[PDB]
Amino acid sequence: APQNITELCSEYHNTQIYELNKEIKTYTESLAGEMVIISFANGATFQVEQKRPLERMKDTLRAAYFTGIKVSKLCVWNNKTPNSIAAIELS
Amino acid sequence: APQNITELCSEYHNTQIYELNKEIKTYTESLAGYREMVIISFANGATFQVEVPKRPLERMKDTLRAAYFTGIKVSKLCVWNNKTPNSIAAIELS
Amino acid sequence: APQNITELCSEYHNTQIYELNKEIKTYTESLAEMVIISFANGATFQVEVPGSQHLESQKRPLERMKDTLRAAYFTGIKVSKLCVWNNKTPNSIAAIELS
Amino acid sequence: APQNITELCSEYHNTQIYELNKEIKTYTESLAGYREMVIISFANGATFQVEKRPLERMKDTLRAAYFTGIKVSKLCVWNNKTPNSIAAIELS
Amino acid sequence: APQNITELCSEYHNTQIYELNKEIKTYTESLAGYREMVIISFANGATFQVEVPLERMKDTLRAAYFTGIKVSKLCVWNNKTPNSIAAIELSN
Structure with missing residues (x-):
């Protein structure tokens, strides 16, 4: 199974x-x-x-915002406006 | 989709x-x-x-409670002009 | 509509x-x-x-209120006012104001 | 209803x-x-x-108490189990 | 029942x-x-x-990450890769 965001x-x-x-x-x-x-x-x-996974991602990004933690990387769908998030790496 | 609260x-x-x-x-x-x-x-x-x-309404409620608890600044609200208190359609935190 | 805990x-x-x-x-x-x-x-x-209080009290709202009260306790934030029902002992919480 | 953990x-x-x-x-x-x-x-x-959901809630409370270092004042437990099973918790 | 992560x-x-x-x-x-x-x-x-x-475990790991609290031990299926988590102990 993929081990990191680049692989995913x-x-x-x-x-x-x-x-x-x-x-x-x-x-x-x-x-x-x-x-x-x-x-x-x-x-x-x-x-x-998509319901459940999308709620988790929304919670994660919201928490990141409130806590000011660094977003390392995003994997995004680039045929969407704005680009849509597939995966997140915090580090 | 629009990428800012004003256009939304x-x-x-x-x-x-x-x-x-x-x-x-x-x-x-x-x-x-x-x-x-x-x-x-x-x-x-x-x-x-x-x-x-339903689920989204719950999410908005949790965002406002968290904002209150943490003292985070609310930048903008998009609200409906129905009732006082006006209903919230969108929030921006910055 | 009501716009504060007193009106509610x-x-x-x-x-x-x-x-x-x-x-x-x-x-x-x-x-x-x-x-x-x-x-x-x-x-x-x-x-x-x-299911109590003429169905004014239901499971999902109560869960949310329990969450709020527990957060208040853990963070030490002040409860400004409660709206409470007096037909129970201890009185039961209808509404919470934080300020 | 009970007013504290001892009564309940x-x-x-x-x-x-x-x-x-x-x-x-x-x-x-x-x-x-x-x-x-x-x-x-x-x-x-x-x-x-x-x-069910009461179980979820209690687990969440314990986890938050650990993460934060909040003191657990009292536990009401069933002691016909090992470890004893928590029936109620008091934080103070 | 088990009383610690090793027993679990x-x-x-x-x-x-x-x-x-x-x-x-x-x-x-x-x-x-x-x-x-x-x-x-x-x-x-x-x-x-x-x-x-497996939402509760996902919530616990994310909270550990956000707060910088130490993960003491993991019980893992070490045949999977990356290894899958069956249980976690948090301790300091």
């Missing part, structure tokens, strides 16, 4: 790794019958997107 | 942005049958709630 | 406001369900049971 | 109160399934377990 | 106890169908995953 990210289609090593600057959450958007100080902006 | 707000009917840039002064929660009511207010008196003008 | 409290039957401005001194939890909180003055309150 | 503990068959006033020294948990346990131990060797 | 680990088949006494250096979570994969790593390269929801 290769298993998906239309994805790439963003290496950020930064805390989340802005956290946005909206009712969508919830969409979650995060941005970083350099302006990189990502959205979340 | 524009996609709902009868909503507006309030720019706050301050921490929640009071957080109130009450039993209301199948759901809890959750009301927040700020130092200038602006009062807002979570209520549809 | 008047919508229920058999309630009162309790003015606290204190952190929770004692948190008690039992699985045989019951959550009880107490403050330095001896003021003691319980969380309601699902 | 008196309501059940084969329970007893242990007074601790100590922080949790060790927290152990296994995966959901038939072998799922949460086990807590204190400095003096005293060890307890949590044997 | 012996209720599983082909498990071992990996002693660590270290904080988690990296936390990775990823979307799969029906559940998220969760992978943790330590500074020495030791890498573990949660799999047989």
Whole structure:
């Protein structure tokens, strides 16, 4: 089984790794019958997107925001606007 | 999809942005049958709630409670202009 | 609609406001369900049971309230006011205000 | 209803109160399934377990007490089990 | 019933106890169908995953990561790779 985010990210289609090593600057959450958007100080902006796994990821990004912990890497779907998160590495 | 709260707000009917840039002064929660009511207010008196003008509603309530507990600044709210307290459609924390 | 705990409290039957401005001194939890909180003055309150108070009290909201009260206890944050039902002993919590 | 842990503990068959006033020294948990346990131990060797949603809640409370170093004041436990099974907890 | 992680680990088949006494250096979570994969790593390269929801264990590891609390021991199926976690002990 894949051992890290780079290996995991290769298993998906239309994805790439963003290496950020930064805390989340802005956290946005909206009712969508919830969409979650995060941005970083350099302006990189990502959205979340299944029920259960998506709630866990939304909780993780929310907690990261409130605690100011560093996001190391994201694996994202690059055919989406903003790009959609497949995996997260905190380190 | 829009990547900021201003444009997201524009996609709902009868909503507006309030720019706050301050921490929640009071957080109130009450039993209301199948759901809890959750009301927040700020130092200038602006009062807002979570209520549809399910799971996502719960998530919003938890975000506002966490914001209250931690004293984190609320940057913006997109709210519906229905009731006072106005219902929250979106939140931005920065 | 009501916009604060005082206005909300008047919508229920058999309630009162309790003015606290204190952190929770004692948190008690039992699985045989019951959550009880107490403050330095001896003021003691319980969380309601699902299906009580004309169905104003139901399982999922109560779980959320239990979460809030436990967080308040652990973090030492002040409870400003409670809206409490007086038809139970200890009085049971309808609403919580944190400030 | 009971107003404290002593009153509630008196309501059940084969329970007893242990007074601790100590922080949790060790927290152990296994995966959901038939072998799922949460086990807590204190400095003096005293060890307890949590044997639906009330069960979830109590496990969460113990885990948070460990993470934070909050003192456990009292436990109401069934002592027809080893480790004794927690019926109620008092934090103070 | 078991009273500690070693006794708990012996209720599983082909498990071992990996002693660590270290904080988690990296936390990775990823979307799969029906559940998220969760992978943790330590500074020495030791890498573990949660799999047989297993939501409680996932919550515990994430909280350990966020708070920097030490993971004392893991009971793992050490035939899996990365090894899958059956139980965790938190101690300092």
